[PDB]
Amino acid sequence: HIAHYDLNKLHSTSEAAVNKEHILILTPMQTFHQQYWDNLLQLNYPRELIELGFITPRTATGDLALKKLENAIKKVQTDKKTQRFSKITILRQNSALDVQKERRAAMALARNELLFSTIGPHTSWVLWLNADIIETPPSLIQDMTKHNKAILAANIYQRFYDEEKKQPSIRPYDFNNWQESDTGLEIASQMGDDEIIVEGYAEIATYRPLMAHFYDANGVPGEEMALDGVGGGCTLVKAEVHRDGAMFPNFPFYHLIETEGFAKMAKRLNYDVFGLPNYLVYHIEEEN
Amino acid sequence: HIAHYDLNKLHSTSEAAVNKEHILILTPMQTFHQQYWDNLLQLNYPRELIELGFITPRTATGDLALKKLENAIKKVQTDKKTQRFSKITILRQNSALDVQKERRAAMALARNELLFSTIGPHTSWVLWLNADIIETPPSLIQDMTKHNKAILAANIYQRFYDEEKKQPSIRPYDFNNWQESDTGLEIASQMGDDEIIVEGYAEIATYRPLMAHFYDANGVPGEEMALDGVGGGCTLVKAEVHRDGAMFPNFPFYHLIETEGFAKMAKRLNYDVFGLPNYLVYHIEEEN
Ligand SMILES: Nc1nc2c(ncn2[C@@H]2O[C@H](COP(=O)(O)OP(=O)(O)O)[C@@H](O)[C@H]2O)c(=O)[nH]1
Ligand SMILES: Nc1nc2c(ncn2[C@@H]2O[C@H](COP(=O)(O)OP(=O)(O)O)[C@@H](O)[C@H]2O)c(=O)[nH]1
Ligand SMILES: [Mn+2]
Ligand SMILES: [Mn+2]
């Protein structure tokens, strides 16, 4: 029956693990990748503080993912009891450039359905971790909460083989982490109320400084940069930002949708959005 | 640990009780009224299908309410086990005309904090029931779900003593249930991006047809009217509307905030909003 919580005593701080701050890791999943799963299992944030939430599309592809995901969860949750995740929720979804717009709008609904259903009165942090992020440091959560920001996006790169240099290498991958520019605002001012700007919209091109390219091999991993747009690859959100209402709009919101409109929404709710240009995590390879 | 739910198999229908559709009744509460509580207990929707959520402000007034509320919950949850509410969550809040704007914006955060924290992967319906609604029919939930609408506002009146006629009587109370008018849109088109229109804004006056006055003593209780703005007095929402993202904006949203901006948000998410002009429920008396 009865559950009592003072939300003002629920903190999100730099020292999340020591303070026993609960985190909810949310992953929309069209394809199950074992390395994503193994990378998750290698996170060293205490398991008793972690809840997991997944949402799969209602398609042949989603159902194959669901099967593999269910099997992986069964193995972990029936191993030693001290190492179980506190809770795991699996949901199936309720629901050019023009293709991208439609796809992003559909994703916005999936993310909301998952977020609303799973966030609770004890959650301090929500980590948005896409199912194709296959490599992070094992201290990902501690590393990111340390910054104590309302919203914090890691920079998403991708490994590949460099044919010229005959050696493994890395390249930028996620261009949804960006700062707004005057050029970006002007172009948006001139647009109709339901026109959406998404990545690859010709005239803005890369005129909104993309975080991916601020990666500095000579810099340090704690570097922070102010952002205006984020993706959902590996993006850490204080629970209070979502509880105040910031969500993933399926409709045009200042000409933005989904994860980018989310950032704009958190700013309207008086939160600041940041990114880590020199803290890289990795999206699955083209060759994988 | 493990919880599985297909959200597409989670229905909100006309025959909610028979279909065992779970409802979450959400009440922000600054003042505990025994008649509100007794009226809630007299609802005859099955208890095993009801979860309750409350959120109180962090003030002397809220803490007095909290004490009385806790006592009332203890009595009900430790009576016969067959009649317990499935779950009860109590939260304390994390956080002219100009006064109304500030008050409504603060309420929007409270409603979101409560909604996000308490809605779950099994919820079919969310009833927003203000803590000063002290009389409804005992079949309130069945009566309202019967309509099978995305959003449905009951018409909120208030009892008083008629001094002239020397007899109990009734008067309209909630003017946040309205239809938009051309005059309303024109006046809003001419306003700055962060100007808010709230009840009592001089120029719109009552030019947005108010549902309160469409009450027809000669009409029938099943009458439906299309709305554009709602309050949170006694307003029933299919869970999918919230899961898709519709929430209570604390920032100006098409010049609307809180419950009115919520309705506008659900419309942007392609939902239709309705009201019951001849289905009256009652806000506590001035004399009470
Ligand atoms: N629930 C759900 N997840 C999806 C869907 N499409 C892609 N995903 C997941 O959403 C995330 C982003 O995937 P996608 O946009 O295809 O890859 P990207 O373009 O390389 O970021 C990954 O976690 C995918 O598994 C969908 O239709 N529904
Ligand atoms: N959590 C919370 N609830 C409030 C606060 N102020 C009022 N309420 C509740 O919000 C609802 C609307 O109350 P109010 O706006 O004062 O009454 P109205 O103007 O007659 O609708 C009722 O359920 C009140 O108990 C607040 O600051 N925080
Ligand atoms: Mn991908
Ligand atoms: Mn009142």
Residue numbers in the entry:
A (entry chain A), B (entry chain A): 95 to 189, 202 to 394
Reproduce passages from the article:
The synthesis of mannoproteins starts by the extension of the α-1,6-linked mannose to form a backbone of at least 10 α-1,6-linked mannose residues. This reaction is carried out by the M-Pol I heterodimeric complex, composed of the mannosyltransferases ScMnn9p and ScVan1p. This family contains metal-dependent, retaining mannosyltransferases that are predicted to possess the GT-A fold and use GDP-Man as their donor substrate.
The ScMnn9 structure was solved by a 2.2 Å single-wavelength anomalous dispersion (SAD) phasing experiment with a mercury derivative and refined against 2.0 Å synchrotron diffraction data of a mutant (D236N) in the presumed GT-A DxD catalytic motif, in complex with GDP and Mn2+, yielding a final R/Rfree of 0.19/0.24. The metal is coordinated by a histidine side chain, a carboxylate and the pyrophosphate moiety of GDP. The carboxylate metal ligand is part of the canonical GT-A fold DxD motif. Both the α- and β-phosphates of the GDP interact with the metal, similar to the RmMGS enzyme. ScMnn9 D236 is the first aspartic acid in the canonical GT-A DxD catalytic motif, and mutation to the isosteric asparagine results in the loss of activity, similar to the previously reported less conservative D236A mutation.
